[PDB]
Design a protein around this ligand. Structure first.
Ligand SMILES: O=C(O)c1ccc(-c2ccccc2)nc1
Ligand SMILES: O=C(O)c1ccc(-c2ccccc2)nc1
Ligand SMILES: O=C(O)c1ccc(-c2ccccc2)nc1
Ligand SMILES: O=C(O)c1ccc(-c2ccccc2)nc1
Lengths: 331, 321, 331, 331
């Protein structure tokens, strides 16, 4: 009698269980950039969104759903209750507090810790086996906080870390050199941000080391000021925030790329933040960006880059800073 | 010599004439959704963004540029000056403010567009879209095949999604057309709704009427209201409109000749005698709209289109260019 | 210290389990067309190939593997031993014998049964939960054979059936109308091949019924002879075989499209062959093509097309003929 | 009134000109692998095939056309007559004479030269401004022949060169190290074939030089025998031919990737053969593979790789042997 039933004969009951589900936590501008980038690359057969702002959340979900004709991701869901995130292979954390003025660093972090104490247990409860990917800043610290709270082995807790900044570096490199970023290679490692380390000895096109051609590369004795590009990279995000208010598109694309490696088990190497106690001369429980092999089991291996003693010292300094801070957090 | 020249021997004096360039005018939430959707579909070898808000504009450009490693569009440019848009195949208009005001705005945007891309196709998304497509058309001087309104494209996609939810199948497999004037006055063509060539109206003759126990009529209402419901929740809409626009971009750039519910100057057809744009099923390719399907309409569906034409013309009569 | 261990520090011990594995059985031209199309649509994270021709098999695997740089499917495996197919979501059967001089078509069918008696139990053993998609001809009969041998519920055994033929029909429709195949709708249903049924009443563009515009559509009294469009469809495989000796590309593309719906749980409606006893007036255990909702559990629902009395008669006759052949096969 | 005219009202009476047309010359297994890969990457709005085997040609065209529903390339054409190739952006030559015996090299080349004397003039007649991409072996010599016959400037005449062999190298590299080929970097340069040059110095993951971790890399004294990996690349085509009779998929994928850089003006660096007189110590009109910037105007720039004296002389010798043969060609 009903039209559906007149039109369609049902032969199979529902067993409905997601096979490649991704959850994004937080629907601010970064969260939604990750979401659209992930939808348009067909990485998931289901997408879930969660946030505390219920109207905003429902709106974003609906807008995405109205695009269904143009996507190959058949199920998009959302809710404040984390049961909608259940059985995710990958859960991306973009939520957090924004540093107020006068706040102080340690105080900003703690407020983010307090948010994660609510988020992380809810993620783990409904997706015990997922990979966690943290994007919230400061990423290296907050990836640690998510690791400790979730109880997950280190291979399953990832920080986007320096992934986008390495992408920005390759872009600026390509602009100076007149070739596409895809063909330009450079690595930024360590602590996300201004303390991050541009590995000059690895920068090359077509296997041709720029440092071998141009020995001054990276020093202050450089007429071409290539050391500036790293600073350009670091500065360029705050430049963008100053211009449009925030950044979204690039980080979203960045995160989708990582998600691809994970969902398809590509085992590509990305500069991302991993718990590297024991490597790179690091002694504390700290996340730093190093070239990681990324696949369906998270970070399985790490490339041991050969660093100068200065570069090694930089990583140690950041490890001390990060640790000193984490030592003062309330969990 | 410079490091670049130690690394790279140049063999050709490079001339950059973009071959598959697309411009988005307006970097609001709609314009930027179009941009990112277009970028992720690999439709252009160059993207230009233009807006009057210079800081916002430069910020959006830089943000997209930073994602270059993950894209296949080698050049992204922007500026308030329209030289940056030069030689575009397709220029998508998302800027706007009424109507005589938009006329005044378009009186600046469109001639700037035509000056730097004399041969481009125009795609207007700005509301009220049927009227502004007419405006952009008159000011442009372009023949009608080259000026296109997003029209009922998204609302059809919304309708098809809601059809899919009700039937338990993907929107791709649910067919249905919303035509005419974009918005509250649009026409849900009940007679064409079908899955796998099976008319819903033939199975269920009450489809779309008040006596319809399933209230399919409310589905069209829900479509007409959905933008409003989404704005109420998040403040605006973006993703779906951007996706629907990139899909039109795709048919154009790849000369697909797919059929879309978009707004075209339909004088001479469907009984209309004025210069107005309404959504009908249009064949869309590298030359824009070259053909339209003649939907068989009920006598009152027809009178509904004629009414929208007189409504649009009534407004269009006033304006001055 | 090995170069690998010098370069890369291992942090995890992988027990590799494929999450979106597809297997193609038979690396003839049809099988390798399915394989390349599936690879270029990023539908799987692992591809396995099996065939009895061991050299040919290894050669195809290696050729595909040499392309890994340009693909996003990290693992391509092969072997005559079906352990390589273990834990496949989807297994595509293109293996078959070709007729000799010589033998009747029935005798040719039985030899394909004997081939399936070997393949199907091996497939089921290593992938108990997979869906089966049978492409080998005659496809309605061989899909039934696979159903029977496998013991799978009907929702999981799918025949490619009239999927390609409908695609061909839509292409020829679009050539006549000056519109892309994506916007021309029309269905070829029933038994794959000569006896297939062009459902004239369903043919439309933008929801405008051609039949209503042109009541002669598909009749002998039709001055535009649209029936010849169906005849072109029925003959197109033969025509391509006369010119190039076989067909590959189109069937491969049409199979990858079915694979997409399955791997991504899209629930798109495809004209494919399904066990339809109990529907469409059919009283026998036969597979015929009807519009099927295709997803991760295979065929969950079928659309009930309104058929004329003469159309129902063609289907029933097809069911009789199919069933008649099936009783004569040795299982 | 015809059904078409009842259904569709024509508003525009317009003409032809394809905007991103690609032509493939030769519908052997290589040309068709190029074609399907190009079709599935959405690189063209029109595809033309040409070959002297008219039935085969028409068969392949039809087979591809039947897959229209599943593609986004609206027009596929073919003909023995080159007018079908008019206004191509890019023309890919995969036609050539085969090997028999008693190779007076300047014979199975001079015969290819006589074949090109027919093809290339026809190509340039209908596409005066196309880029030429030669894949036929021997590729460095045949790219020179097409360059001479066409009258084209060197930037627009390209040979596939060592592009696939580098991809194979990066694949084998990935297998040894446990990471995807996309993250494994290495270049094979110079004369395509046995005499190609593995550039040991440039091989790396994430900017870490393997030669620097492992100085013996590439030498006979290499305990890990990485020299054999290059030899394995040089032999792989022969190994695959031995197994399946030819190679197709890998070369096709590699060629489509060059086509992408051209059609989208990506300016990526690929190891392809380019007329390198004046560079790398060479003074003759020959084509060798070096890292090239590839865009909408073909090869506009070359990367100058730092070579060992041993590597340099190896390239110089290749140049002289190529010229030695080219001298003896009758045009
Ligand atoms: O480096 C950037 O551009 C960058 C990185 C992270 C974020 C970010 C902002 C809010 C919430 C989560 C992440 N924004 C910008
Ligand atoms: O139907 C909608 O949701 C819809 C349509 C157009 C627009 C739109 C808004 C501003 C500028 C251009 C276009 N927004 C929403
Ligand atoms: O309709 C066609 O073109 C068509 C369909 C199936 C097959 C086919 C041939 C051998 C093995 C398996 C399948 N060939 C051609
Ligand atoms: O290296 C290879 O696998 C390889 C390269 C070229 C070709 C090739 C063969 C015939 C015509 C054109 C190109 N085959 C194999």
């Amino acid at each position: 009698a009903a039209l559906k039933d007149q039109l369609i004969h049902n032969l199979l009951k529902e067993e409905h269980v997601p096979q490649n589900k991704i959850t994004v936590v937080g629907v601010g501008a970064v969260g939604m950039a990750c979401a659209i980038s992930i939808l348009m690359k067909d990485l998931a057969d289901e997408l879930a969104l969660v946030d505390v702002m219920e109207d905003k959340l429902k709106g974003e979900m609906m807008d995405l759903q109205h695009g269904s004709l143009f996507l190959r991701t058949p199920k998009i869901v959302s809710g404040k209750d984390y049961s909608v995130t259940a059985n995710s292979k990958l859960v991306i954390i973009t939520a957090g507090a924004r540093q107020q003025e006068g706040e102080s660093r340690l105080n900003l972090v703690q407020r983010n810790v307090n948010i994660f104490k609510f988020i992380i247990p809810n993620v783990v409860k409904y997706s015990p086996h997922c990979k966690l990917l943290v994007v919230s800043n400061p990423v290296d610290i907050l990836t640690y906080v998510a690791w400790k709270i979730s109880g997950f082995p280190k291979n399953r807790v990832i920080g986007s870390g320096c992934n986008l900044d390495s992408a920005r570096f390759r872009y600026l490199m390509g602009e100076r050199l007149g070739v596409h970023a895809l063909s330009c290679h450079g690595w930024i490692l360590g602590e996300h941000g201004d303390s991050s380390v541009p590995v000059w000895s690895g920068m090359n096109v077509a296997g041709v080391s720029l440092k071998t051609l141009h020995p001054e590369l990276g020093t202050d004795a450089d007429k071409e000021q290539w050391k500036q590009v790293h600073k350009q990279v670091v500065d360029s995000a705050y430049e963008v925030i100053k211009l449009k208010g925030y950044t979204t598109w690039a980080i979203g694309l960045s995160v989708a790329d990582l998600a691809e490696s994970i969902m398809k088990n590509l085992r590509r190497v990305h500069p991302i933040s991993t718990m590297l106690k024991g490597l790179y001369g690091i002694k504390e429980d700290v996340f730093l960006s190093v070239p990681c092999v990324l696949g369906q089991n998270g970070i399985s291996d790490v490339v041991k880059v050969t660093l100068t003693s200065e570069e090694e010292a930089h990583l140690k300094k950041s490890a001390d800073t990060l640790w000193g801070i984490q030592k003062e957090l309330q969990f």
